[PDB]
Design a protein around this nucleic acid. Structure first.
Ligand SMILES: Nc1ncnc2c1ncn2[C@H]1C[C@H](O)[C@@H](COP(=O)(O)OP(=O)(O)OP(=O)(O)O)O1
Ligand SMILES: [Cl-]
Ligand SMILES: [Cl-]
Ligand SMILES: [Cl-]
Ligand SMILES: [Cl-]
Ligand SMILES: [Mg+2]
Ligand code: NA
Ligand code: NA
Ligand code: NA
Length: 326
DNA sequence: CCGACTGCGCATCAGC
DNA sequence: GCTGATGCGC
DNA sequence: GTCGG
């Protein structure tokens, strides 16, 4: 990428602010600046040039000037050698360990992978699974494996009930050559915004996927959202595939377009689009787009017949999924 | 200057 | 138990 | 940390 050095710097700063400073708005500000620089189609020559972009302000412009002239950022070089910041940043790489738990563990002298492994009884269930698969969860998934995973999920769902529709979203739907995890949107005509005519709709699908040894572990599970672990079957004498994160979201069938818009992302794209909606007087979530009243109270959901309808309401030209990787 | 910053499911905890 | 807040990840 | 009004 043309400006990878700068965007890596801003990403490292974002992670510092989230994990160590617990400053969520700075985390989001740094990620917004990284995203807008990442799509800028020129190699940046100065901080002033970058400051023309929305989300890049005075302080980031100065950091860009430092980075361009020296290849480094003193602020980050100091963070990298600070033990407490390093410890906290490492611990948050375990799924289920966030900024608060990371700092609490450091306080208690739980600081390394070996520390975590000998203190499993101090981890909740999610953290325990995150530790178990620490290495695997940092490996990306090639699209070819995503296709095999898609084939299993769609066929197993069909066997439970042919009226289910499962749609793989996230980075896969945006056409990525590799994905961090698998995201599956699920619908069934029994579950709408008007009624739930059948219970256990998500449970049934999870169970079937566990029964064929595709889903291997559960991080969290409720009526509409499953988060867990899966693994492709391997062949005779072949090394096993890494374990992979899988999320499944059951969305009311009449709200598919809002749900598929949400679950396709990217996360920053959704943030930017939802922010634009607010400036247009709407609010978007994974279920509906609603107008905001004069008082800032969401009104009734607007009719939605396609993903493009949502774009039309907020006066955005339609963007195909592959153009949403912000 | 300064209020506002996208939006939410599930796990966990506090207070009653 | 319920309710509401916080953590976490999405 | 950035920005709109
Ligand atoms: N913070 C968020 N706000 C709004 N939507 C989000 C947020 N995080 C995630 N999403 C939505 C958009 C994402 O594309 C989708 C799936 O999440 P996620 O799996 O983390 O990202 P991803 O599929 O885009 O990339 P990856 O390849 O890393 O898995 O959920
Ligand atoms: Cl902040
Ligand atoms: Cl650096
Ligand atoms: Cl919809
Ligand atoms: Cl809603
Ligand atoms: Mg994903
Ligand atoms: Na700017
Ligand atoms: Na984590
Ligand atoms: Na995901």
């Amino acid at each position: 990428t043309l400006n990878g050095g700068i965007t890596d710097m801003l990403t490292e700063l974002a992670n510092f602010e989230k994990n160590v400073s617990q400053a969520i708005h700075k985390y989001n500000a740094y990620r917004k600046a990284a995203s807008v620089i990442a799509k800028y189609p020129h190699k940046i020559k100065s901080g002033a040039e970058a400051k023309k972009l929305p989300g890049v302000g005075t302080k980031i412009a100065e950091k860009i000037d430092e980075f361009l002239a020296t290849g480094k950022l003193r602020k980050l070089e100091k963070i990298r050698q600070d033990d407490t910041s390093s410890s906290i940043n490492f611990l948050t790489r375990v799924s289920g360990i966030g900024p608060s738990a990371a700092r609490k563990f450091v306080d208690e002298g739980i600081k390394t992978l070996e520390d975590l492994r000998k203190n499993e009884d101090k981890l909740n269930h999610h953290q325990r699974i995150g530790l178990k698969y620490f290495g695997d969860f940092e490996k990306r998934i090639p699209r070819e494996e995503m296709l095999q995973m898609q084939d299993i999920v769609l066929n197993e769902v069909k066997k439970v009930d042919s009226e289910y529709i499962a749609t793989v979203c996230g980075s896969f739907r945006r056409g990525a050559e590799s994905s961090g995890d698998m995201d599956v949107l699920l619908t069934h005509p029994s579950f709408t915004s008007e009624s739930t005519k059948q219970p256990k709709l998500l449970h049934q699908v999870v169970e079937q996927l566990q029964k064929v040894h595709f889903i291997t572990d559960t991080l969290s599970k409720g009526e509409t959202k499953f988060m867990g672990v899966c693994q492709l079957p391997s062949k005779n004498d072949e090394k096993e595939y890494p374990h992979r994160r899988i999320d499944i979201r059951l969305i009311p069938k009449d709200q598919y377009y809002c749900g598929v818009l949400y679950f396709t992302g990217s996360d920053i794209f959704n943030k930017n689009m939802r922010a634009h909606a607010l400036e247009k007087g709407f609010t978007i979530n994974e279920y509906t787009i609603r107008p905001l009243g004069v008082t800032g109270v969401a009104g009734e959901p607007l009719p939605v017949d396609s993903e493009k309808d949502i774009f039309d309401y907020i006066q955005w030209k339609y963007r195909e999924p592959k153009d949403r990787s912000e």
